[model samples]
Target: NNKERIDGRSLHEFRDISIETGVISKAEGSSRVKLGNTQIIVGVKPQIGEPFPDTPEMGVILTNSELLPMASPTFEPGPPDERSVELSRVVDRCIRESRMIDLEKLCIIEGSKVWMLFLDLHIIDYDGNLFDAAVLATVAALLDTRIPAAEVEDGEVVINREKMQPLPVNRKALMCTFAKIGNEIVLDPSLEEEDILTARISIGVTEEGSICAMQKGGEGPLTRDDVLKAVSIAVEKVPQLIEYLDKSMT
Candidate 1:
């Protein structure tokens, strides 16, 4: 059994999981999520700011992720590189394009100002499947996020730290990454498998069973059928993640 897959799971079986929320007290919300040997923590903090001129009625979101040298010797101390930037982009699309958080509700004053969420992701361990781990950790953190009460007074912003409300989330967004290695498709490849994987795909699905975003990686040739099959596999895997999201909220 262990021969077919190093982790001894079926083709689509995910890695072992351990998820916890509210892991950081200073941030508005945080989560520590573990998958296989991959661990990451996501933190969400909020600030009052002006909405984009194009979308005055909505808020904005910013995301950053770091792969520390401690997690892997390959990383160097510096600004984000392509890998880190791509991870944040893919995770950002999973939430923003899915309408998971109602941006319209985040507007404090239409055309004047709104709330902006700074979602930061930090990698505590390096194994593989960072995309999946990042997305799940972010979802859990947002589930635990609270909005500080705010309003405009005398052309100035008035905030009440003593009063806070839960973030307005309208949908559940989940994602998974699958790799094609050695002529077979597998879910949640380990670091060793990743080193040799031919191709990979990351799929993000909404609570309504629709795919919100998809990103393909690696140099493998995947047929059209392969892409659809990957999507179906991800769809099947999301319900359990949603269940865990709800569980973490508590």
Candidate 2:
């Protein structure tokens, strides 16, 4: 007999996971992952570009998400909606705030020439917790990315495609999501549980065990104690997830 939640698993149990790289041949890096019924694909494309004027020293990482009409019944063909925007922002916050990749290393000619990493996420199936799936795919794709080294000479950037190298990454962060159902908060809730959830929170933590980013969702307000408990659970669970990511990268 299963003594766990509705899915017959432990309170902290996660669904079956499968990850594959090079899903997109044309992209610099790409990965597709499946977490139980949820499926997502992430592609990383690198190009020579100018860095933002304010943060010229840092490289740019832009995230975009698409919900295909065939993936979910509720999805429609149109511009990005609020949910898509939120997904991109949340994933962006986790990687950006954690400073996982050293942006300065991407600069070939300071502000004039740099490598811009574009991350695109597409939801092929949505069971629940798209945020976690998105983050996993994003990180995996980044880890799989390789960029050709370049140098600036004579006011022009010289590229060495034969001398490719991986981007300089400082840290690897993980994101954990929890949904409050009734008086209990569950980790990695499914679509049904998410629909009935009172509140949801996603906590992003770095490898050094520091909280870098946090976001709350749902209509219900969360008490300070509830929020604290969620953080505690997330911090404890993040390491295992990070380990899984590390193993996948290798």
Candidate 3:
């Protein structure tokens, strides 16, 4: 079943996707992703540091996303508003819940030494589809990241500059968002289209086709069948994206 949108595309058709890696030399890992007109850059910084108290053996990934004022009129320069906060948390959950990066594997020492990965997502261009663009940028950044060698010396950990190892990535995770407008489900909605949407859902899927996370937007309710339909569509769309992501890493 094909449905047309005002944007002159089929409902199930997504906007074009593009990914660029190693854009930020300062970051251990960095990437820029473009989904249609929306673009975001994610930079990963590694700190040889202690582990979170609750998860002593596991390293931490601190994720933050900013919707810069220049990116959109609705975005303002202030403490993180809910939109940015929610995007950061959602992207964080997609990565963490998917267990994409091996947390315990990042620990350089038992509980005393670990590498803290600080990921910062910057919105470059905002047409729409922030969730998909953000997550895509993050996944690419993680894949491009490298961890410098660290060893325990006496009670201190010394980081080595001689060699770097790729970050341990066990699985690939990405998000696909569908917007509902007038009983029609569309993929990768644009700003003007999003303005009139009655409901939307973002599904995060792993390489194995398992759902890692889902976020709902708009106050309208999505029926059970609608959710299943969305999931099935997402599942079909995910593998293609994963292939695209893998290609970008190379």
TM-scores of the candidates in the order shown:
0.96, 0.95, 0.96
Query: Candidate 3: deviation at residue 90, Å?
Result: 0.7
Instruction: Write candidate 3's Cα lDDT for 33-118 as tens digits.
Output: 98988989999999877898888889889999989997888888987898899999999999999999999988878777898999
Clash counts for all predictions: 0, 0, 0
Q: lDDT tens digits, residues 1-250, model 2?
A: 1236877867667788788887988887899988889999999988888889998887888889998886789888798788889988999999889999998888888777888999999899999889888888888888888888787778988888898788788888888888887677778879888888889999898888899989999999788977898889878888898888777767
RMSD of 1: 1.6
> lDDT value for candidate 3?
0.89
Local error of candidate 1 at residue 94 (angstroms): 0.2
Which predicted model would earn the best lDDT?
3
Better of 2 and 3 by TM-score: 3
lDDT score for residue 46 of model 3? 92
Order the candidates by lDDT, highest first. Answer: 3, 1, 2
TM-score of 3: 0.96
Which 10 residues in a row give candidate 1 its minimum summed lDDT? 1-10
